[PDB]
Amino acid sequence: LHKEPATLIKAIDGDTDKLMYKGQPMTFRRLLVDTPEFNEKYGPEASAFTKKMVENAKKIEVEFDKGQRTDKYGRGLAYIYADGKMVNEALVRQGLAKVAYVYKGNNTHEQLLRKAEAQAKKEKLNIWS
Ligand SMILES: Cc1cn([C@H]2C[C@H](OP(=O)(O)O)[C@@H](COP(=O)(O)O)O2)c(=O)[nH]c1=O
Ligand SMILES: [Ca+2]
């Protein structure tokens, strides 16, 4: 897979951010994760976590997988990196997202994330507390 440049337009929520990619504004949905809704336990904390990561980053990158690059809502599907740290993975590792929406072809980093979730669960972090 390849990291590509993007700039933060606006942090949205635990699952999504508005990013400028190839000079066009786009909502990006993070591959392989599901964060709680704002009304759900740890929903606000998940959005807060990603907001800080993306806002504080000097460099945002997007990494498409081998399959669909846009979902049925027109959202980009990618791994999102903030100063080379993957936000997707970071969420799961902190117990603020579950691994989810694993479709064949778009699952390059599935095992990495599952390992993170196992650790979060063992440490009883957040949604696993
Ligand atoms: C994460 C992801 C979601 N989606 C679709 C499935 C879901 O359809 P439905 O809206 O019909 O439930 C929705 C979940 O995204 P959200 O968790 O952001 O709602 O986005 C994909 O098609 N591919 C993906 O990789
Ligand atoms: Ca969600």
Instruction: Indicate the burial class of 38 (C-beta count within 10 angstroms; 0-12, 13-18, 19 or more).
Output: exposed
**Active-site residue set:** 29, 37, 75
Here the tokens at position 84 are 């080379």
Amino acid identity for residue 37 in this structure: E
Query: Which ligand is closest to the CA of 34, given by its number?
Result: 2
Residue 62 · residue 79 · CB < 8 Å: yes
Max alpha carbon distance in the chain (Å)?
42
Residue nearest to atom 18 of ligand 1 (CA): 15
Separation of alpha carbons 35 and 98, rounded Å:
7
Query: Which residue stretches of the chain are H helix?
Result: 43-56, 87-93, 110-122
Residue 113 · residue 90 · CB < 8 Å: no
Task: Find the 17 Cα to ligand 1 centroid distance in Å.
Answer: 14
Residue whose C-alpha is closest to residue 76's, from 12, 124, 22, 28: 28
Residue nearest to atom 6 of ligand 1 (CA): 101
Return the CATH class of domain 3-128.
mainly beta
List the domain boundaries for the chain: 3-128
Here the tokens at position 125 are 């972090």
Q: Where are the beta strands (DSSP E) in the chain?
A: 3-11, 16-21, 24-30, 33-34, 60-63, 76-82, 85-86, 98-99
Residue 82 · residue 11 · CB < 8 Å: no
Here the tokens at position 35 are 């964060």
Determination technique for this PDB entry? X-ray
The sign of the CA dihedral 28, 114, 103, 38 is: negative
The resolution of the experimental structure, rounded to one decimal in Å, is 1.9
